Amino acid sequence: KKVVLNINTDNMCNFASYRLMPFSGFIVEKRIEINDKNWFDMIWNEEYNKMRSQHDKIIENIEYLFNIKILSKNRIKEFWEEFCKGQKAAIKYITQVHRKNPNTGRRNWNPPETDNEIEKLYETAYNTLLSLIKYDKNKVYNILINFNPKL
Amino acid sequence: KVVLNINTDNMCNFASYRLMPFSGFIVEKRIEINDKNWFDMIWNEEYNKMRSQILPDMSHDKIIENIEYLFNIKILSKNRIKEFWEEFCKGQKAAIKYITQVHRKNPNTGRRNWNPPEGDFTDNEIEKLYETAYNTLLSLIKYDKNKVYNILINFNPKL
Amino acid sequence: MIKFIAFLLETAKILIRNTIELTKITFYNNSVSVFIETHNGNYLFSGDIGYPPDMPDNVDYLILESTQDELIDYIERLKYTPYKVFLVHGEKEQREILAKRIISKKIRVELPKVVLNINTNMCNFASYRLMPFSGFIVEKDDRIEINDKNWFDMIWNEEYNKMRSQIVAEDFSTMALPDMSHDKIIENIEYLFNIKILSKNRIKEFWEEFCKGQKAAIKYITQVHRKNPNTGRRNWNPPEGDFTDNEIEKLYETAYNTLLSLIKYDKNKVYNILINFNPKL
Amino acid sequence: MKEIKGILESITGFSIPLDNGEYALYPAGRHLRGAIGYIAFNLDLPISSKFLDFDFDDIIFRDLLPISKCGKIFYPKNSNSLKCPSCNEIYGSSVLRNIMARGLSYKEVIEGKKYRLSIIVKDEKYLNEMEAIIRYILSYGIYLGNKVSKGYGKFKIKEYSIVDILPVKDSVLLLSDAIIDGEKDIVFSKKEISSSKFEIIRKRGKAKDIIRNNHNGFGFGEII
Amino acid sequence: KTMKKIYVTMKTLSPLYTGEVRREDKEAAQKRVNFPVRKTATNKVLIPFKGALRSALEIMLKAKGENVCDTGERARPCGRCVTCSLFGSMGRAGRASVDFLISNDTKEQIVRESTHLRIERQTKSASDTFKGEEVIEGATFTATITISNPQEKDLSLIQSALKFIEENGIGGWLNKGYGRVSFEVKSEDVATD
Amino acid sequence: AKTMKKIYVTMKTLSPLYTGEVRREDKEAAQKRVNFPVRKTATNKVLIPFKGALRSALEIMLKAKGENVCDTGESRARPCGRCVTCSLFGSMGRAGRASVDFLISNDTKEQIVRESTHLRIERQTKSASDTFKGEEVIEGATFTATITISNPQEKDLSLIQSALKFIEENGIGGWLNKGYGRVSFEVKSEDVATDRFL
Ligand SMILES: [Zn+2]
Ligand SMILES: [Zn+2]
């Protein structure tokens, strides 16, 4: 039967002998609390989340694709991050960024700095790093150290 | 203390929390929680003070059944339900005046401003359907805003 | 425009018979007064009065002071009588008593964000003209406007519509839907994804309305599939293909049945179903 | 012999870079001294005049271990983490969060959590000296960790309680790092304003752990 | 000693962006937002506020002719300028310590996911899109500028750099209109508590 | 370095003006009552992205003259950092000299934003196959934007005015092929010593 207010009672008008303020409400029942929209946006997010709980050839190819910017420093860092994560994340990553969208037709690789040559260079990136996905991690580290200084 | 002055019907259930979308006026009076009615009455009270110084009842289920039937014969279209939502939301005297306006048989033409029924009906019964429409849409004005919205968004969603 | 405090004048931002030219400024003797000229004004700060002073050559504005006959003598003998005089630096009742006499010589006085009236009646009660009014003061970022309860009614109704169409009855909360195996769900949603009836926006909207409970998903799929009585149009995207008219209807029925059958599957299971189609969510 | 017990909330995140690449999980009492030293330096107090000396007892700044959800205090050997006797929470690395700014690679512990204040004054003159800066930091804010001028590491005191000290007798568990000539590397600084002198003073000692007789003490070495 | 306290209130008059710096939170938001806004774990938006001040005073006092070093660039503070005495140098500690610009509001009220494009100029169509997150307008942020050992030329320089922030902007994406704001300032001198 | 060009642009709509709503929550809140909401502020004023309009206008007109200007239009393209649009609007290694403010209207939504009813008519039956609602900014609505150019050359004024006549010809915002967004610009230019706040 009790009532508790949870909205600011400070920036309120005065008119017609009543200190009044137009306000938007979200009357909750438990006491009977009157909440604003920030609490409702919160609860909406937190119920959402809650539901949301459940070998020289590769060197030559990588040296080519570093200059025309197809593979890039972010690409080296994230491909090496997939390799350091393991091997399944590597195949998933290069499958995801090689995935040409059937609607638009644009791959997620960086463009070279014809369409047949574009497809051939993107396939070169696929066979290059998919060949690199099977070698030992030390060799991947020493090849990736040469082009990205950090990783 | 704080007093809510609103009947807590139309309370939905968001997850495990019962919930009401509502608009009002914090009054530092007993720290009262007052609806729009309050504001309209106190606006008109101050208008009269400033200038001074210088419905039949029908059951809810019968309202759904009759508004259902009048929706199927297209006496009550969604244009009518939308404009009735505008005139009820503006107030009740406006909704009374609007419903009397659309139901007034013009003495020179003999025409009501409703939409004619779909189907074969006798002219006496077509008139009785019109009088039924007057009775339900007038009886709808006796309710609050919440049940009027909840009644007429099943027929015109967007009203 | 004079801002009273001394006397500030905003044109050059000076604040109060040879001619110094800064805004032509020139000091005449009071027996001292200053006559300033600018493109928007010919103002005169007189100072006090003592009997035969030196009035300037047109004094558009005359800002004088008194605490009575000599003030009015100086209000005359000035060619091209001022537009508005200003009565400063004195007691209020004596300023009003002088001011009644400047009104009797037909010369206007004023005793010491832009605001817009969006109002609309008048009354002639007492000495001043008026219209009684109860309203609202909005304070927009470069204006301050005045409104009445019709405008508050319109924004109150907009807030009521925007807040009613924001929380459904049993969404994110806790039967008799169709049933069909996972393999036919694969084949149907592949087939209805190549042709565009089940598209990535529609899979995503199914994902949000499934996360908001089964009944929210049932409501969404019904109102997508609901054929209108009048137009006969369902809220699906049309299939891209020859499909003449009846397998159009059987195909929308297939979309209805496949989504409704996918509803009772587990949330992780419908997630592993949908991400093959819409990678986002 | 009184205390200054306090719950301090990190409004902005804080960073202290220990050796080889490790960052502090919580702010240390040497930083709560150093910042109060700057504060008194600009407040013209005798505490400021004395803060140059490390062996200055009286006012002793125990480190700022965090408060758990169970209203109690986390405890740390060989465990680069913090556990509490209610056994509800493990505060550790997960709180670090690596920040890559413009050319800067560093890490900080996030904000929104609560930390202890405990200044064991022994003589009441320095209790009044400490009361004035507590009533200063309540007004504005204390800045712990590196990058103080940029804004990192703001702590608001939520509770200024002038509690009283009941000594401890044991032969005990170290809440911070003692300086016995053991095997823990403890590094710190003696930045000297009005001398333009900065020196990194390095020491060895004991880790934060089991410990046994007089124990006339116990802000690197603390134990309870 | 006297200590200047400059309470800085900032009402934003334009969408605001400042990139998230937390790497694991960046990859946490990267599946949803390509440009996450720099947030707290208190879920509040903070903005870097010292290098904007230092850059504003640097460029302004530079073109006035006062001897300052440009701490953009191999950047090395000298220890001699008005800039190095106010905001800091290598050796000498900064007299001014300027807070992060934390909002008075939380994130689910003021920062919203948004849409940015890259449109081909011949086909006149959206070639690329990306979800950058951005801070709404009218969101009021707050900081305190703690100045120690003040000169008389300390109020005017801080409000002059604040007016340069009012015209240049704060945060990121400063050229596409993001970050145009206004400042309310309130100053006090504190000497003894 | 010692001077900034300031370009006070006041633009008045000679046509309906549609730009799209950008914020996801604002769009999804107004994807119910209207289906194409316009870009709003949280102070309820209409935002138009202005930098890309000027940059696109300059790039098409400068490629028309045969100058060696690049194109940041194609997918994932590269600012070469050597053209005059690269000097003005920026590259990846250097920022833009011309900081271009958003086109901030002086009115709010109830004065200039109107909802609408846009249709799709069947070609043979001549009946409305589709209906959708979309907000637009009215004709006669006026907007302001301040373009501030640090390190000014001689030709920044001429290029910015030329871009503005190209924006008047093409339109600004969205639905530019249907006649939306055709406007007129007025420019008040002023040279500024950068230290005027001191
Ligand atoms: Zn320097
Ligand atoms: Zn270029």
Side-chain angles (χ1 to χ4, degrees), chain E residues 54 68-69 77-81 84:
Chain E
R54 192 188 179 68
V68 296
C69 41
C78 286
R80 311 297 298 100
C81 21
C84 293

Side-chain angles (χ1 to χ4, degrees), chain E residues 2-30 32-73 75 77-91 93-151 154-183 185 187-193:
Chain E
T2 324
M3 248 195 181
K4 204 71 153 323
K5 309 253 92 153
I6 304 264
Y7 304 154
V8 183
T9 288
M10 173 182 59
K11 205 198 82 73
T12 168
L13 284 42
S14 176
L16 203 142
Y17 155 78
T18 309
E20 198 39 295
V21 285
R22 316 221 209 221
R23 207 201 316 111
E24 321 109 324
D25 314 351
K26 259 223 283 183
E27 325 257 347
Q30 225 59 1
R32 256 161 307 251
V33 178
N34 293 117
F35 290 100
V37 181
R38 193 169 181 181
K39 281 159 217 103
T40 62
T42 282
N43 260 323
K44 257 171 156 53
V45 183
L46 41 76
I47 317 177
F49 197 16
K50 187 196 160 194
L53 274 185
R54 192 188 179 68
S55 275
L57 274 193
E58 265 173 46
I59 306 186
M60 283 198 307
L61 295 174
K62 186 175 182 297
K64 190 167 174 253
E66 213 294 335
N67 220 19
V68 296
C69 41
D70 221 47
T71 64
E73 288 296 337
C78 286
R80 311 297 298 100
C81 21
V82 180
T83 290
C84 293
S85 154
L86 207 44
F87 295 135
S89 64
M90 269 286 231
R95 291 187 294 99
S97 80
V98 196
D99 274 336
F100 276 147
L101 265 184
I102 294 207
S103 45
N104 314 337
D105 322 291
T106 316
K107 81 176 193 63
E108 60 300 10
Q109 157 183 0
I110 86 171
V111 46
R112 317 219 188 280
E113 302 179 356
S114 75
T115 321
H116 300 94
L117 276 47
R118 184 209 297 264
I119 304 175
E120 275 165 358
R121 273 59 155 131
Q122 296 327 346
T123 88
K124 292 174 289 295
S125 47
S127 179
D128 252 358
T129 206
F130 49 103
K131 267 198 199 103
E133 212 171 11
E134 89 185 38
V135 174
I136 77 155
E137 313 70 31
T140 299
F141 313 77
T142 300
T144 312
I145 308 206
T146 302
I147 297 180
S148 292
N149 317 352
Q151 330 150 351
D154 267 351
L155 205 61
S156 60
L157 290 290
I158 295 264
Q159 323 194 132
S160 296
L162 283 163
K163 274 198 306 263
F164 199 81
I165 301 332
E166 277 176 356
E167 80 159 341
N168 187 18
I170 220 163
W173 295 345
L174 275 168
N175 293 355
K176 42 179 58 59
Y178 277 87
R180 291 321 182 299
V181 308
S182 89
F183 279 115
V185 64
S187 34
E188 64 179 359
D189 306 21
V190 178
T192 295
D193 302 287

Side-chain angles (χ1 to χ4, degrees), chain A residues 11-20 22-30 32-36 38-50 52-53 58 61-62 64-68 70-72 74-76 86 89-90 93-94 96-98 100-105 107-110:
Chain A
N11 191 46
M12 158 202 323
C13 302
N14 186 6
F15 159 78
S17 43
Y18 315 68
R19 194 169 119 100
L20 64 96
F23 94 104
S24 274
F26 262 106
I27 312 176
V28 195
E29 170 77 23
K30 299 296 177 172
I32 299 80
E33 35 167 316
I34 292 76
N35 306 12
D36 61 346
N38 95 327
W39 162 101
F40 175 83
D41 220 336
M42 191 244 185
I43 316 308
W44 192 102
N45 303 344
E46 95 181 5
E47 269 55 358
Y48 188 60
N49 313 143
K50 218 135 73 183
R52 311 304 315 309
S53 55
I58 77 89
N61 278 0
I62 280 194
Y64 192 30
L65 300 170
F66 197 60
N67 83 26
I68 40 183
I70 291 188
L71 64 78
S72 305
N74 268 329
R75 195 59 61 190
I76 294 173
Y93 199 89
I94 321 296
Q96 190 182 8
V97 281
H98 203 41
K100 197 230 298 293
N101 224 67
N103 297 354
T104 61
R107 227 162 315 268
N108 275 15
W109 286 135
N110 196 48

Side-chain angles (χ1 to χ4, degrees), chain F residues 40-112:
Chain F
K40 294 151 177 19
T41 61
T43 36
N44 285 315
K45 291 174 129 223
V46 174
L47 283 156
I48 313 163
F50 201 22
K51 188 182 185 185
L54 296 167
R55 179 154 196 162
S56 34
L58 274 186
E59 288 191 347
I60 319 152
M61 293 172 323
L62 283 157
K63 184 150 109 53
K65 258 167 47 93
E67 309 229 45
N68 86 348
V69 154
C70 58
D71 265 303
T72 171
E74 53 268 29
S75 71
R76 221 153 307 111
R78 214 73 55 51
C80 77
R82 319 177 289 111
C83 330
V84 317
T85 58
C86 265
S87 171
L88 205 84
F89 294 116
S91 178
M92 271 158 189
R94 284 193 47 42
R97 291 188 295 104
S99 164
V100 186
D101 199 7
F102 275 131
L103 268 165
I104 289 329
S105 84
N106 321 317
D107 322 275
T108 37
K109 328 181 323 309
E110 68 299 22
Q111 280 163 1
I112 63 185

Side-chain angles (χ1 to χ4, degrees), chain D residues 166-168 172 174-179 182:
Chain D
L166 60 163
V168 175
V172 48
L174 282 179
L175 303 175
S176 62
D177 272 345
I179 53 176

